[PDB]
């Protein structure tokens, strides 16, 4: 297959693998959320892998992230920049956040070349924003906010 396709699918496969590790360091609530993300990533990989032939994620899946983002934005009201991984648990999420953005860079290459994955790219962007919030929430509860 095409190299941009292979690289994007591989990075996505890496993303869900790191998420699969991080979900053993979060509560039962976030674990259910991360597992939903894993299913979405699987659906995304099918779209990109089939070069657009197989349907990817729906519009509601992106709207689902935004529901969570708006929800956790009310819990996170920090001003100064913070150092990643205030706690071990949040550190796992900060890692997944960066892998998600790395997946985004690969998908954007596919979109700019093959014209597919625009929906998936938007998902990964919102995903990284959610993983940021989820990481800060954990640090807030345990009060381990390390600032610059």
């Amino acid at each position: 297959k095409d190299s941009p396709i292979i690289e994007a699918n591989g990075t996505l496969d890496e993303l869900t693998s790191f998420i699969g590790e991080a979900k053993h360091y979060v509560d039962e609530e976030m674990k259910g959320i991360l597992e939903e993300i894993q299913n979405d990533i699987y659906k995304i990989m099918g779209e990109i892998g089939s070069k657009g032939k197989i349907e990817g994620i729906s519009e509601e899946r992106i709207a689902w992230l935004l529901k969570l983002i708006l929800r956790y934005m009310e819990m996170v009201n920090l001003k100064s920049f913070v150092l990643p991984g205030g706690t071990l648990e949040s550190a796992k999420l900060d890692v997944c956040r960066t892998i998600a953005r790395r997946a985004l860079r690969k998908v954007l290459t596919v979109t700019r070349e093959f014209g597919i994955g625009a929906e998936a790219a938007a998902y990964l962007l919102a995903l990284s924003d959610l993983l940021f919030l989820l990481a800060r929430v954990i640090e807030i509860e345990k009060n381990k906010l390390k600032e610059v």
Binding site: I62, V107, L108, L125
Partner: protein, 121 residues
């Protein structure tokens, strides 16, 4: 950025136009792409409208987000999907069939764009 929401007169919403605009601005600000006071949105009711050639009672809801160029396609797609979510949940009903909700994201030329602040405070 500039947001323009157009709704047919026969379209029923779960909220008032003002409440819809507030929800739209919150969604746009949730992207972390724009400053708060820069989000300028407006709502317009369409009095004269036709959807197709068929003789069926129809109603549609369209939005047009105009942002300055520079953002990638992932951001533009996310913004559109964000507004479309807000608009879809606001629709209570219209016509005698399904209501089509659409959101367009267009880019304004930044280099020729003029902006000033008057009556400053």
């Amino acid at each position: 950025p500039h947001l323009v929401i157009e709704a047919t007169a026969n379209l029923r919403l779960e909220t008032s136009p003002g409440e819809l605009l507030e929800q739209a601005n919150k969604a746009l600000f949730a992207s972390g792409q724009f400053g708060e006071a820069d989000i300028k949105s407006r709502f317009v009711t369409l009095e004269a409208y036709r959807q197709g050639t068929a003789a069926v009672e129809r109603a549609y809801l369209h939005a047009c987000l105009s942002i300055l160029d520079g953002r990638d396609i992932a951001t533009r797609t996310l913004l559109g999907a964000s507004l479309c979510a807000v608009l879809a949940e606001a629709v209570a009903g219209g016509g005698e069939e399904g209501v089509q909700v659409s959101v367009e994201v267009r880019e304004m030329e930044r280099l020729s764009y003029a902006k000033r602040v008057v009556a400053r405070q």
